[PDB]
Amino acid sequence: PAFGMQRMHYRNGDPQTPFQIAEQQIQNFQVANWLHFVNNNQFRQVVID
Amino acid sequence: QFDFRASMHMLTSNLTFTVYSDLLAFVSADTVEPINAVAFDNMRIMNEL
């Protein structure tokens, strides 16, 4: 709604999350970049001590 | 004139059979889980979360 885009018709069980679709469909760099970070923000498995 | 020999006819029929009325009585039908019910396009009828 902020960017005037049609409401996302998201299918339950879609392989992609809503943020992953929005990342491709959002042309604003800041919003898209934050969306990309949220999509790829993961824990790092590391052996410590 | 009544001619007994000429009036004798061998009537033929089936020895025995059984007649049934409601064919669908012999069919037990169920439906898939409605969450997974598909439409003509092989997609689920309803997809909103």
From TrEMBL, chain A:
Q: Where in the cell is it found?
A: Virion
Question: Coiled coil located at which positions?
Answer: none
**Record note on modification:** Sumoylated with SUMO1 and SUMO2. Sumoylation of viral proteins seems to have a positive role on viral replication.
Origin, by domain of life?
A: Viruses
Family, per entry: Belongs to the rotavirus VP2 family.
Q: Oligomeric state and partners?
A: Homodecamer; each decamer is made up of two conformers of VP2, called VP2A and VP2B. Interacts with a VP1-VP3 complex. Interacts with the intermediate capsid protein VP6. Interacts with NSP5. Interacts (via N-terminus) with NSP2.
Comment field on protein domains: The N-terminus binds RNA. It is necessary for encapsidation of VP1 and VP3. The N-termini of 10 VP2 molecules form a cylindrical hub underneath each 5-fold axis of the inner capsid.
> What's its job?
Inner capsid protein that self-assembles to form an icosahedral capsid with a T=2 symmetry, which consists of 120 copies of VP2, with channels at each of its five-fold vertices. This capsid constitutes the innermost concentric layer of the viral mature particle. It encapsidates the polymerase VP1, the capping enzyme VP3 and the genomic dsRNA, thereby defining the core.
Q: What is this protein called?
A: Inner capsid protein VP2
Which species is the source of this protein?
Rotavirus A (strain RVA/Monkey/United States/RRV/1975/G3P5B[3])
Lineage, top ranks = Viruses, Riboviria, Orthornavirae, Duplornaviricota, Resentoviricetes
Q: Entire protein: which part is shown?
A: 445 to 493 of 887
